[PDB]
């Protein structure tokens, strides 16, 4: 539907599914997976060449994941612009590139005139929605304007009445090109090209369609996995994390440490902290965690895998979760069903405790709550109150029962 290039993963390769059969050359340095993700690295052989058929107002869309700046190389990050995708014929065409937290789209007509349009994301947020996380880019061009959309929403709109005819016949090269660091890479997914200027409506629909999966995602946007170490993030308490309380079978809530060095330009909260959790299947064939799956939520206490429990019979709306070694106790529940109450794209998920798989009886959802001692302290909890709230439309992203799982990732160092 107005699509003239559709790069998708087939048979360990990248193929044009547009119907026009552009040829696609995937060199040895490009890592590929069956989640349609490909990685461009610093290597000379990390490159993709596609040749458009010549017998063919335009738009480019794709998902991208850009690693975090190194806390050592901020100056290079802010100043060294580098190409990722270039499309030049007779010194004319287009090009996407990155300089730090800025992704930029440039045009250059037949005379060599230039305009550009960028999206820059914040590099001082405690928790960022963009840094090293999958997000959706769409770039549209017509007679007068170049617009950039991020996750379906308009972010930039530069005027280009100056810029006229530009050539898009040329070969499209996917390749990191500039004064990049050795460790620089970029992940990309679902690259497409359209012979029309997409509307905000089309772009937002594509965003929802390409977000949908049967499975849950991790904090980074990748599929959520069984048997993999995760730190836990709460979207209703962004700067808080869970820690097993010394000499008590409960998880206390603490405040995240932050970046603690001398840079005017950057700030973030630490992500690799709190207990190392891990999800285990409750069996009834890949390691992907799907919506409505029944799971055990565990964590590592020294060299012991412990488990997250709830009392079967507690009085109030809320009760502190019970953290303890793996064992069968008919005083506690241990089975969790992982949910997705959000209709809209999110990397949040929710955690429901139930009596049994077959029972429609719901105990409550995992969240964070203030409790009174003798003072007032947050604890890792279950609450019955979440049960009605998650049914409300539109879904409430800021609820404490929204959790995200953060595995160690090479795009994020702290």
């Amino acid at each position: 539907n107005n699509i003239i290039l559709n790069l998708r993963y087939k048979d360990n390769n990248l193929i044009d599914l547009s119907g026009y059969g552009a040829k696609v050359e995937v060199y040895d340095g490009v890592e590929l997976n069956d989640k349609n993700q490909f990685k461009l690295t610093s290597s000379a052989n990390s490159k993709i060449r596609v040749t458009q058929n010549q017998n063919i107002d335009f738009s480019v869309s794709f998902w991208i994941r850009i690693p975090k700046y190194k806390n050592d190389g901020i100056q290079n990050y802010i100043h060294n612009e580098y190409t990722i995708i270039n499309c030049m014929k007779n010194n004319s065409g287009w090009k996407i590139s990155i300089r730090g937290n800025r992704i930029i789209w440039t045009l250059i007509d037949i005379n060599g005139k230039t305009k550009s349009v960028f999206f820059e994301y914040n590099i001082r947020e405690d928790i960022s929605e963009y840094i090293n996380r999958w997000f959706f880019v769409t770039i549209t061009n017509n007679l007068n304007n170049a617009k950039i959309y991020i996750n379906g929403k308009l972010e930039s709109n530069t005027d280009i009445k100056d810029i006229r005819e530009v050539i898009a016949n040329g070969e499209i090269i996917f390749k990191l090109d500039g004064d990049i660091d050795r460790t620089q890479f970029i992940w990309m997914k679902y690259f497409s090209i359209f012979n029309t200027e997409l509307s905000q409506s089309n772009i937002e629909e594509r965003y929802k369609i390409q977000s949908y999966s049967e499975y849950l995602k991790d904090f980074w946007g990748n599929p959520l996995m069984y048997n993999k170490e995760y730190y836990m993030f709460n979207a209703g308490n962004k700067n808080s994390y869970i820690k097993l309380k010394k000499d008590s079978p409960v998880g206390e809530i603490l405040t995240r440490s932050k970046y603690n060095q001398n840079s005017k330009y950057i700030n973030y909260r630490d992500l690799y902290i709190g207990e190392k959790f891990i999800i285990r299947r409750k069996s009834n064939n890949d390691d992907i965690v799907r919506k409505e799956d029944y799971i055990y939520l565990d964590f590592f206490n020294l060299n012991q895998e412990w488990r997250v429990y709830t009392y079967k019979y507690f009085k109030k709306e809320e009760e502190k979760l019970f953290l303890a070694p793996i064992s069968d106790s008919d005083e506690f529940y241990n089975t969790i069903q992982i949910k997705e109450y959000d209709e809209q794209p999110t990397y949040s998920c929710q955690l429901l405790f139930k009596k049994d798989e077959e029972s429609t009886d719901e105990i409550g959802l995992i969240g964070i709550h203030r409790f009174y001692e003798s003072e007032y302290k947050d604890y890792f909890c279950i609450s019955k109150w979440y049960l009605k709230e998650v049914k409300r439309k539109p879904y409430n992203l800021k609820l404490g029962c929204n959790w995200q799982f953060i595995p160690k990732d090479e795009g994020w160092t702290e």
Partner: nanobody
Amino acid sequence: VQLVESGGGLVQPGESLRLSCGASGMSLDYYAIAWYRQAPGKEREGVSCISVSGSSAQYLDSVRGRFIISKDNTKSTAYLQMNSLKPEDTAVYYCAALADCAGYASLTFDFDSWGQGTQVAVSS
């Protein structure tokens, strides 16, 4: 609630040693047991893992056929039987109690900083 290694020793190539992994405070009836070893200052590596049921075992390729992992629920201890020992087996051995063997080898236990472990050395 402690999970402690013992049975390490100093031996000659070809000889045998038996490590035990003793659980206190809890019971291994629900636990899959993994062994790891770390030589100074090489990369730490997964050595073996036995299932909760005890009917399935996994081995590092370089120890298969020499090492036998087993688990005795009634004693709450699991074992690494090490036969035909070689110099390359020299390491500090650590154990962990897991829900499941899946993914065991790439778990990031900070044994160096809080591990106890038991020392194994092989030299002719």
